[PDB]
Design a binder for these strands. Structure first.
Lengths: 255, 257
DNA sequence: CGTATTACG
DNA sequence: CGTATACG
């Protein structure tokens, strides 16, 4: 079994100050995917770039201190691709696609659509660009694992206040429909394979102290292509790991 | 009666508020509180910071957002408050309040820091010149004056822990030290030194080197009076245990009648 | 070091 | 609420 953890850390330097490395060394994932690092490698301490027993990969945005994704792994991939082949989507530090032979691992920080209509439109086009790429690979016979911050709660069970958020980016009908479509394209929301409970969230607003009252949203997911779903042994939420407004999520994969 | 004035370069009034400023303020209960480097306009402050029970507040922010700025809280409001010397470049940086309490004028002044450039050192020195013309005109007209705030210069070698290594650092340049000498010769008295002639008495310490815990400091904050008023000064002291900023507060007590 | 700026979330 | 250039 291989353990993969995904975490939108909302600042890698920030979580580092809070004890990221202590947590990392206790949890011992085989592969760790991070989103929203808000750093390029040259701004990171050495102990963050060089972690014992892991190869690290950093894919920053062009804009300083914005977005960015990272991957640490005990076995290195045979390749790592950092975009879809579309400039506007490939320069925000949102995409790592690592080839582990048994599977391709997509580590994706999907755009947030809250700030503006243009950014909602960018988010939905990113979604489409993502789906084209992953389908190309799956069709070629590759098995695929996708984790990261999708920035959308899929169904009503996936946030504490569905009614109030019907017109808020993150629970818009159009966004929820893209996830339906993604699933209908042959992919499985792994957490829902094992847990059909409500109150299971991965993000809580800092602003209203939402975490202590568990007023959250499930924005972070592990998906696999349906042909690969038999190899998924566990999908869970690391609810109690603090340090970010998102908590980590986990996947156990056989082979 | 006995009047207590406290001066404090807070380095962010919202910051000190978050650290317990109002609690300290209620404990100390000065008659007048002068603050420098508030880094805020009144609209950025909560209502309870704008209006403290028993005090009237006067905020004089810089044109630039979150930069500089001075404020004053007083139990008895002044008859008038002037917010400049009448020189535009000196009057737009939120550095000047001149309040008339009838018995005296109180200047609450955040003097400029000259460390960043030659341009800003020249600015500081010209601001010193404009300040001296102002206070002299008021004094010459028959007013007693109290001047407090952050002068941004340690006067003598006793006024900082490391005088030699700062001989060419703004804050301890011969030209700056000489200006304080000149201000004094114009008929003004550094009140702290009326009562305390010891070394190790400082009001500012660098955050960057954790200087405060080793007391590697500078005396940058002062209360001056015109010499004719000095017999009214009962005490002048440093509130060195009061945390929350890289400066500590200073105090003056005066007795009128 | 630490408090502001503005952008983003 | 909190994590990402200017001044001091």
């Amino acid at each position: 079994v291989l353990k993969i953890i995904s975490w939108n850390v909302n600042g890698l330097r920030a979580v580092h100050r809070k004890g990221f490395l202590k947590w990392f060394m206790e949890e011992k994932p085989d592969i760790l995917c991070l989103q929203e690092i808000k750093a390029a490698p040259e701004q990171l301490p050495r102990k963050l770039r060089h972690v014992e027993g892991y190869r690290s990969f950093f894919t920053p945005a062009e804009r300083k201190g914005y977005s960015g994704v990272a991957m640490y792994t005990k076995v290195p991939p045979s390749s790592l691709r950092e975009g879809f082949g579309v400039e506007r989507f490939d320069t925000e530090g949102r995409i790592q696609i690592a080839d582990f032979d048994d599977f391709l691992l997509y580590n994706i920080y999907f755009p947030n659509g809250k700030m503006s209509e243009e950014r909602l439109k960018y988010k939905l086009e990113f979604y489409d660009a993502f789906l084209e790429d992953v389908n190309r690979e799956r069709d070629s016979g590759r098995n695929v694992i996708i984790c990261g911050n999708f920035n959308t709660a899929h169904r009503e069970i996936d946030l504490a206040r569905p009614k109030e958020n019907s017109n808020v980016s993150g629970f818009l009908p159009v966004e929820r429909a893209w996830i339906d479509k993604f699933i209908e394209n042959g992919y499985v929301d792994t957490f829902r394979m094992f847990n059909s409970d409500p109150g299971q969230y991965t993000w809580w607003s800092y602003r209203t102290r939402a975490r202590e009252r568990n007023v959250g949203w499930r924005l972070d997911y592990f998906f696999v292509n349906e042909e690969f779903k038999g190899k998924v042994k566990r999908s869970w939420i690391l609810s109690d790991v603090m340090g970010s407004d998102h908590c980590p999520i986990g996947l156990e994969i056989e082979l």
